[model samples]
Each structure stands twice: as structure tokens, then as C-alpha cells.
Target: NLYFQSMGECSQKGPVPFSHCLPTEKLQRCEKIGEGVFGEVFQTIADHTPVAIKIIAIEGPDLVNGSHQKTFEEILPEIIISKELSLLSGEVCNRTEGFIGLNSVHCVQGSYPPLLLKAWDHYNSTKGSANDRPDFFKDDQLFIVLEFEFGGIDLEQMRTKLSSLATAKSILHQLTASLAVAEASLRFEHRDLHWGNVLLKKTSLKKLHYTLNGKSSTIPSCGLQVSIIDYTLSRLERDGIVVFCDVSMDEDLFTGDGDYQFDIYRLMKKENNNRWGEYHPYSNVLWLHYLTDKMLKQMTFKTKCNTPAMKQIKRKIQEFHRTMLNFSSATDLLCQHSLFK
Candidate 1:
């Protein structure tokens, strides 16, 4: 009923209350972690494992955080695209766990869960909340509870540890490889892929598998795994259905500047000609350029031990960014990169 497809082969399915799925009484409450235009995100332990809960206020009559609440129609495409992209982790032909793992989706109708309010307060008191408080919700309000595997720190936060040439190389290598897989399989374009949306987590795994253009390949993980999070402005194809946000319709998205990220919104608009519904592969390459720029200039690195290698990478990445547009797409970019070649 909540636009969620059942994973069970033959099992019956219907909407389950959020409390039934995430029972506030059972949650080991923690503090808020992050927020997006659509939801306020929090972290908790569902018994033993950490879970990132993105509670989205939906289908409500009242405006939330100064904007109209998202209806079922508004969020359905996002969930569909997220699940489609998440499915890449296990595909036989092309795969990478480079996207966020959505563990479950729960539709709730009620006041804000009590334990989560406490976490919100704790976070507001310490880190400070930016949006409206959650206490205003009425009992009849609806919400979509998206549970994700606890994605570790975003690259925006881990600039300090982003040193080591191999680590940085591995991060971009994994992401580019993953994007190439999605590009081949789903014709997916992460229209808003940015440093803040790219997360890093500690992993014991050594290598990741990726299959593109009929060839299956593997690469080292460098003791770190990257997860691409948030798809608000993403576009992908399924059964000839294309899902994407029309940024051209939103003037504010194009008016922002200060960081390299804000510049890409305008850059993407120019590249795509404001036709966001159309599938364009160059968007991925645009983001790849922004990331490489971040690596070369924005990200902090420890050059104490590896000054020579450090300076050498700057020279390499400069040209990589200088002429990246020539490759035209993530799949094309992968073909010429040293990491893949």
C-alpha cells in the first residue's frame, strides 16, 4: 500500500505500522545524525545492529518545515529508484555495494515516536537542529520510515583521513566502478552526486566485483568501502520508465554558490539542457570532476611521509579533471583510468 514491493516470492504483503516494525519501546535510542530537504535522519540500535532511520513526513494536510508535505506520489519514485540502485549489490552481471543498503521500509500513522523525540532533543541541544521541531505532528499524520545500514562518515566529514594516495585512489576507483555498473544496467545518472552524499565505512573485505560491457572485474577495497547515499535528484530507467527531478523547475537549486558542489548544479543544467527527464550519461562525469577537484584541493591530507607521491598525484589529478569531459561517461571514464586499465 505504501508503494513498496514485497520481496517474498509468494508471501502476502500489506502496510505495517511503523511502530510494529521499529517499535519505539525496543529501540536503543541515539542522537540525530543528519538531515535532507525530505527528512530528518537519526541513528539507533535495533537490538544489536546500528540502523539509520530517515523519517519522512508524508501525505499530511499541514506543511512541514515551511514546505508542503510530500505525498505518496512524490516519494514513490525516490523509493523505487533507491531500491533499484540498491539491487546492484547482488547482480550477476554488474554489481557493487557502493550504494546505501535499505534494510526495510515502514509506513507509520501516528504522532512522532517518543524515543526519537528524545534523540532529536539531544541532538538539538548539542549539534543544533536546522529545521522545524518534530513535536508538531498530529496523531493522524503519515510518515515513511526508511531504515538503512549505518553509513559511516561522509567524505565531507572525513577530509582529514582522506590522505594516503591508495586510499583516495581506492575511494574514487570503487565509486567510478560502481557508477559504471549502474550506468550499464539501469542507465542510472546520479544528477546530484557530491562529496557530502558519498559515505565511507571501515571494511574488512579486500576486493569488490564489477561487471560492465560483458566483462567481470575486481579491485581492492583499501580497507574502506564507499556507499553512495541520497537520490533526490537521481534519474534511472526501468521498463522504459524514467524517474528524475526537474531542477529546471526549481530556481533555488541553480542560484547557489560558494563550494564546487553548488557549481555543478549549473554545470549539469548546461550539459543536460534542463531536460532532466532525458537520460544523459555526462552528469556522472560532471560529478566525477567535482570529486576529483575536491580530492586535489579541498580534502585535507597528511603529506608528512609521502610528499613526493602527494605532489605527483596533484599533477595527475589536475589533468584528469582538466580533460575528464572527453570520456563522456563513467563507463567511458573507467576505460582510460590507470586504476581500471
Candidate 2:
């Protein structure tokens, strides 16, 4: 009873049958567009609008996929974190639509639906899914459904087309500003904001609007919109509630090496002294640094992009990168940086 009640209070939905809420019979789904240890994400139409549905098998006696199923109780923090951050887009004093748009959530009962299973097959055939097949569940199994606005291509895919420095700066500005807003309102720290979680979409608008600490501002869109997502390891302190993940329980997260991305986990652990629940926005600084590193080194712009002005852009970003550590948090970075201020 506590399990369902906590989730209801967090997500604003009561017990819902999987079939009644997500009837995938005739809807055209985008197979398995994304996946994580928590669940699999499928893109489909909901209420005539494009939506991303993340399905997670839960309450099973054994592990689903390669990890333990996220129970309703364990998932409540994610609901709270996503909802609070998404609402910032509508805020008057501080706002940015850089976070993933969470449309709704549902806790459903039943086995894997045939429509979703078929979509899974398509993705498995095309993308080689890492998740185990969903068809093996029993009829009484439980699952959680999260509906989000279709976040576009991730930074990893879009990095190849990053042909100009202005566009790279735009990405940095959007990410930092979004983090600033969230940090101010919720004391938020996205502990795992790697390249994969940063989604980019093309837009017709020339500039993007923002409000930081009650001041109005805008940055060049460069025909792109960035959405910072994946709150599975995020920590936010909002209102009277505090929600976060206990990454300390998982030692493998801190032991990885090879890329700058892996180094960030170790850096964050050092910042918090291994305390996972505390709010230390310096952790955000580490991720911003990681992104800056990615843009400068790993991301190779096309041959035509290496123009004289591109070198100039590189100089500017390098200067910004060198001084970024002076600011303790993204909020400080936004309020003080001349470009953002």
C-alpha cells in the first residue's frame, strides 16, 4: 500500500491498468529509441502528440534486464525530480526548457504488451539492444510507464555535425544556464550528465529566451535546442522535499576509467566525500568541464568547419574553460560570466 501511495503522491496518478493507460494496439511506435538499466524508451504518439514512453519491469522476484527492477517507491524520487525541473520552463523569475519534458507517469499491472514487444523486436533487429527480451514476464508482473516529449538526438550523434564554434558555445550556454536555474530553485545536481543525456533538436528560432535570477536574457539558438536529461543520478532540494539517488551503494560507478566521462564519477565522489544525498553544486562544475572537454577534443568538426573564425572560437572557449573552475556552481557561472551575465 505504501509503495503505490508514495508513487501516487509523487506522480499524481493512482493505480492504473497498463492496457487502459497505454493501449499500443494500432499506434506506430519508434521501436526502442533509447535504453538504460532502469528501463527501455520507445517513441510513440500520445493524444495526437509525439511522446517517448519508458517502460520498466518491476516487482519481479528476479532481476529484469541486468539490474533489479525499480520498485514504485524507488521511482518516486525520479518523478519528483523530473516534474520540478520541467516546471522551470514556465517559471517567471528563472526558466529554461533544457530539461527533458516529462508528460506523465503511470504504474501499471500486466505482462509485456504485444505491441511493445513487437516494437522491441524491431529495435533489437536494427540496433542490437542490450536489454533482455521483455516477452518472458508473467501476466501478473508490474511495470512503470513514463511519458516524455520526444527529446531529439543526443550529443554523441550531433557532435559530428558541430561545424562552428558559435554553435558549441550555444550548447555550453544553454547547458550552464539550465543548470543555474535548477540549482537556484532546487539546489539540483545532475550527477550523471554525460554526452548521452544531452539531447539536441533543430529549431527555426534565431534566439532562445531565458530568465536567470529574475534577469531576462537570450542566447543564439544556432538552429539547435539542447535538452539536459536523465535524472537517475540527480539530486535536488526543492520546497520541503529532498530527492536523490544513493550511488554510494554501487561501487562500479566510481571505478570506471578511459574517458573524461568516467573521471567525472571519481571527481564527484571526491567532492562529496562519497556522500550521495548532499547538495554540492561543484559536482555540476565537473560535468560542465566534461562537456567542454568533449567539445574541444573528442568531437571532430567537419573539414570545412576548421575556418579562421573557428580557431578564434576555439580560443574563446579555451579561455572560458581555463577560468570555469573559479566558479563553484553553474549558478555562479551564469551570474558572473560576462557572456551569460
Candidate 3:
């Protein structure tokens, strides 16, 4: 947490630095990276490398004085997301792990470093225009500098360039692989997964119209790449969960407790009460509900599992798997307009 006594008008001595604040000496050749209500990000070269510096707003005297904490918690999912990214490295992932195949040749798999923090510290310690110090020194803010993706385009941009179903499927398969690893590594479910958070490497291209308008005519070919971003709302669970089920079911673990818990947890609700109104399949809970209903209808009967409910459970599992797969395919296609190509 950051402190802000010097930031207010009452203080003659100016703002006092909080304990959680990072030092700035680590970052050099800095530029104002980006900004929002909280603060700005800096793209600085740290130790001969580039990084993104994020300055986040921390709740101040108002929260400490008894405001709605849960509301704030619901609003900030990035904190958790950032922490998760810090813990996960590209090395822990592979094609077998999910989502690495699309650009396996480009994977860096390196861990984030502490220099990012140092860069932000440097940004704050520098004097500003109004004789005011950097807003980062406020108690109401926390600053973090992490590995930077230079002008990295996000998912929406990638989807724009996807031109065929084959390519779309390729991206989906890669994303599926990555999401699985993310699921296992984070343990907490990612409540929000969308194209916007997925980033693409920076590229330059001149649109045909622009090129015709006396602009440089060189056009860079595009390829699909994906990276999960914005971890503020992510849910973390235990790591390295055992996977259950395979297409052939050579092993019985697929029929084990791990599979059951994993599937059930995704269901819209604990019961079949159907109390929730409006069937929005777009929502995660509803989608899970649909999956659970389908999966429950597909189980097969075995003499060893003669319980009356076993058959129903088997049926449900199969249905859920099918529903989930189709949903993934359809979503990948729709989200990436290039699929029609």
C-alpha cells in the first residue's frame, strides 16, 4: 500500500513516500509510456532491455476510513493477473501444454525481472513541471514495471488479419493449449478471457488507400499470435491438477474424482434449480451450465459402477465435452473474422 500525506494541500512538506513504493534508479532513457486516471506507464530501457512500467492507483484514506472494499475488489482484476504473469514463464508451456504451436519459433520463455520496478522508481524520483513530484509517490498508488511488449498489438488486431478457417483453427488450437497451461499454472480460473487481452507483436503496414495517398507502399505480412493479458480478475487455484478423461479412455482416471470436480465447478450453479433468469450463453456461468447439462447425458454404464446415477453422470460428461468443444470452435471462428477467408 502507498501513502499520500504530502499529496494533499494540508501538507507543507509535500507528500511522504509509502513503504510499498519501488525505487527508480533501475530504469533509464525513459519516456512517458501511457496514462490513465491512476497514472502513466513508461517505456524505458532497463539494463539494455525494454520494459513496460504500470502505475496503478491504490485506494487511499477513503477506503481506510470505511468505504466499499468489495466494490473496489470487484473492479481491480489486473493485480491478480499481473502476479500470475510474474509467476508463469514461457518455459512452463509447450505445444503439449497448449497454445505454443502458433509461434513456437518466437517464444522467449524468459522470466520477468526487477528492473521494471527500478525504472518506475526513477520516474517518480524525478522532479516534474508544477514543482509537484510524480503522481507515483502518492499513497493512493502502486507502481510496477514489468517486461515490455513494444507497441504489441492486441487480440482484436490479430482477429482482423485471420483470413481462413484453417488459420482460425490453428490459432484456436494454440490458444487452447496455452489456456490449459494457464489454467493449471494459475489454479484460479480466468473469469475474463477475450481477444482484447491477447497481444500481437508490433508490426508496420501501409493500408492500400494510404499507400496510394503518397505514403510508403511497403506492406508487412501478418501472422496470428496470442498472449493472455489483464489478470486483475483472474482466479487462482492449486497448481498441477491431474487431468481426467481422454477420447479413448485408456485410463480410468478420466472417470475419477478430478474429472468430476473439475467439470462440476464450471457449472452455472451447484443445483439444477434453474433459478437464474435469462439464458445468456455468452456468460461463463451459463455456458458452464449448458456444458454440465450436456455432459451429464453422455456417461456409459460399467458393471463396476452399477449405481443408478452412474449412467446419467456419464451422459452429462460426454455432452459437456461436446458442448465445450463446439463452443470453443464457434467462438474462435466468430471472434476472428478472417475465418471466412
* Predicted structure with the largest lDDT when compared to the true one: 2
Model 1 lDDT tens row, 1-341: 52442343213245455566566554546568987667688877886878788889998887777788899789989988888988887787777788999887766777877777887888789888777878888778888878888889999899888646567777888889888989998999998888989999888989877777678887788889899988989999978888887777899998998988888899889988899988889889989889988887778766422567666665666677788878878998887765455
Q: lDDT per model, in order?
A: 0.80, 0.81, 0.35
| Candidate achieving the largest TM-score | 1
Q: What is the lDDT for 118 in model 3?
A: 48
Off by over 4 Å in 1: 1-15, 24-26, 303-311
Question: What TM-score, over all chains together, does every model reach?
Answer: 0.92, 0.91, 0.40
| Whole-structure CA lDDT of model 2 | 0.81
Give me the displacement of residue 140 in model 2, in angstroms. 1.5
Task: Report residue 306 deviation for candidate 3 (angstroms).
Answer: 55
The full ranking of all candidates by TM-score, starting with the best, is 1, 2, 3
Taking all chains together, the TM-score of candidate 3 against the true structure is 0.40
